[PDB]
């Protein structure tokens, strides 16, 4: 056995069809925080949503932040699920924007981020294709008897 720390270069998914690999691993201090003090854990590139045109996830985020406040697993399902328009009501009284967006402070500078940002809980499952398996190198190795080429 060995316990792999999720090293740079490890495929993650959004369970929603986003299939990606981590980039720089930033420290803690960096990346936004806002008012509670929380630090977004995974931080994700926006561009993927429009060209892949998948808004399901981008609702799942709302449903998530709404869930963890009421303290209830909140449902969703094909042709059905929790009706979005009430999700707002659950947040707006508890202080978070009627849509998922919220302010954040860039960790680097420390001044307000000039545009709103949108975040909540999302379920990111980690995949096979751990890199420490898949990296490969050779100097001069064995050759097959027949062709005597690597």
């Amino acid at each position: 056995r060995q316990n792999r720390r999720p090293e740079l270069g490890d495929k993650f998914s959004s369970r929603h069809g986003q299939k990606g690999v981590c980039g720089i691993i930033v420290k803690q201090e960096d990346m936004p925080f806002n008012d509670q003090g929380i630090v977004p854990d995974i931080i994700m590139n926006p561009h993927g949503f429009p060209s892949r045109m998948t808004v399901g996830k981008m609702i799942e985020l709302i449903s998530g932040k709404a869930g963890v406040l009421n303290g209830t697993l909140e449902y969703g399902t094909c042709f059905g699920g929790s009706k979005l328009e009430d999700m707002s009501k659950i947040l707006v009284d508890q202080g978070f924007n009627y849509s998922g967006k919220d302010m954040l402070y860039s960790g680097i500078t420390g001044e307000c981020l000039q545009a709103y940002i949108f975040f909540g809980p999302i379920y990111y499952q980690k995949l096979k294709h751990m890199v420490l398996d898949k990296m490969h190198a050779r100097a001069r190795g064995p050759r097959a008897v027949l062709t005597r080429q690597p």
Binding site: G23, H129, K134, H136, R138, T147, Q149, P150
Partner: protein
């Protein structure tokens, strides 16, 4: 013999011939040395080239 009906008795003309065989996939397609294979990841800070 055997006689459990073993089809690919052909040993020769084909090893020289087709698909990924000798002549193409092996001699013109030679598998190489001093190499490496890895997953990628962006690096803006690094220059081009």
């Amino acid at each position: 013999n055997g006689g459990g009906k073993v089809k690919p008795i052909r040993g020769f003309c084909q090893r020289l011939k087709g698909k990924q065989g000798r002549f193409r996939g092996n001699l013109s397609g030679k598998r190489v040395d001093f190499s490496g294979r890895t997953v990628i990841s962006p690096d803006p800070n690094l220059s081009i080239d």
